Amino acid sequence: XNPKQXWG
Amino acid sequence: YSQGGGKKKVCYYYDGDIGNYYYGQGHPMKPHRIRMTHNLLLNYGLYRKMEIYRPHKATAEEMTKYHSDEYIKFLRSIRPDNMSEYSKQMQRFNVGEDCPVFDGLFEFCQLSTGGSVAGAVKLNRQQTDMAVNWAGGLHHAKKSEASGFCYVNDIVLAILELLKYHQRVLYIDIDIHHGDGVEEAFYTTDRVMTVSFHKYGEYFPGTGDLRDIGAGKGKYYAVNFPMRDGIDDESYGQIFKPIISKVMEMYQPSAVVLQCGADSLSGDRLGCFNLTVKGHAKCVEVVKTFNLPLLMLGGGGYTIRNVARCWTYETAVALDCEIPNELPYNDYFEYFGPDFKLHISPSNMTNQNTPEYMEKIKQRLFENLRML
Ligand code: NA
Ligand code: NA
Ligand SMILES: [Zn+2]
């Protein structure tokens, strides 16, 4: 979900 | 008996402890937004027109009605001080990254799912029209896995409670993400129909294609409307009411669950849509006019100053109570700067959803709706 960090 | 529908009775669920739960440093999911929403409701005097309840902490036995014992017992035991011992088990249940481990995490799941199951038995007992639980709406949770900031799926648990007295339940998901956890739990049954409007294509959670209509007995009972960036109010409104009414006509449920994900508003921290509060709340008006046992739930929303605006107005919409645009004073009046007004205005971004694209997806879904 978070595009700031990760893939979600 | 006679008549149709007039003014509705609403039951609101809220716990004061829900605002102090903290996901993590810089984490976008802030449970504090629920307390902002509740505080804004009180200052609008809407507590005079509704019955406010406090949800119980849903026990592990109620959660295992859908989840597995391995995943529930893990959530009861995992704490920020003993994460290293559960390092392997954190990765199996997707607990760590988007779903971090913080203090009182299991109690936060108990409050969220508590309001949804309490509102479910309240509807089953025919003691209200709409049950509101803005602490719920967590739709990404799996049977033995967490995802998309969701740990325990309150929606699936609340729907399983409705199935004890309702042979057909309709689930509507206006969150900018696809309700993949709710859709997957009832993907192979006709007793629950899942409808989700979401942004598709290089976006969480990656599922939600309109070609996923169900399997087994639940074929043609999974409706998805893929969307693009920057959809506005007129584009969302031209397709919501006709699609919802066609579902109400062909499926004809006896209970409705409307997940009001606020991350589909304009200028969201994680979203990319361009909906306003009036455009978002119009979805509640359409579902409300059908006069069915409704269960309104929360969900997404990461520009918290707007989340308090949306779920407050949508609550007044449930109460049929007009509220002034001038925001009264509240404990968090500083968040709503620099306007200090209830409703918001769209952004200047381009609507990637052409009106011809909106009509084609609508007509493609009407084909699957005729198959009932
Ligand atoms: Na959705
Ligand atoms: Na289904
Ligand atoms: Zn979302």
Residue numbers in the entry:
A (entry chain D): 500 to 507
B (entry chain A): 7 to 378
Can I see the authors' text?
To address this challenge, we develop a computational “anchor extension” methodology for targeting protein interfaces by extending a peptide chain around a non-canonical amino acid residue anchor. To test our approach using a well characterized model system, we design cyclic peptides that inhibit histone deacetylases 2 and 6 (HDAC2 and HDAC6) with enhanced potency compared to the original anchor (IC50 values of 9.1 and 4.4 nM for the best binders compared to 5.4 and 0.6 µM for the anchor, respectively). SHA can coordinate to the zinc ion in the active site of HDACs. In all the crystal structures we obtained, the thiol functional group of SHA coordinates the catalytic Zn2+ ion with a Zn2+– S separation of 2.3 Å in a distorted tetrahedral geometry reminiscent of that observed for the inhibitor Largazole.
Our first computational method (design method 1) started with docking structured cyclic-peptide scaffolds onto SHA and re-designing the residues in the interface to improve binding. Tens of thousands of conformers were generated for each of the 100 peptides, their energies were evaluated, and those designs for which the designed target structure had the lowest energy were selected for downstream analysis. From the previous pool, five peptides with the greatest in silico predicted affinities were tested for HDAC2 inhibition in vitro, the best of which (des1.1.0) demonstrated an IC50 value of 289 nM. In two of the protein chains of the asymmetric unit (chains B and C), the peptide conformation was very similar to the design model, but the observed binding mode to HDAC2 differed from that of the design model. This binding orientation interacts with several water molecules through backbone-mediated hydrogen bonds. Rosetta-guided mutational scanning successfully stabilized the binding mode observed in the crystal structure (confirmed by structures of variants Lys4→Glu and Pro3→hydroxy-Pro) but failed to significantly improve affinity or selectivity.
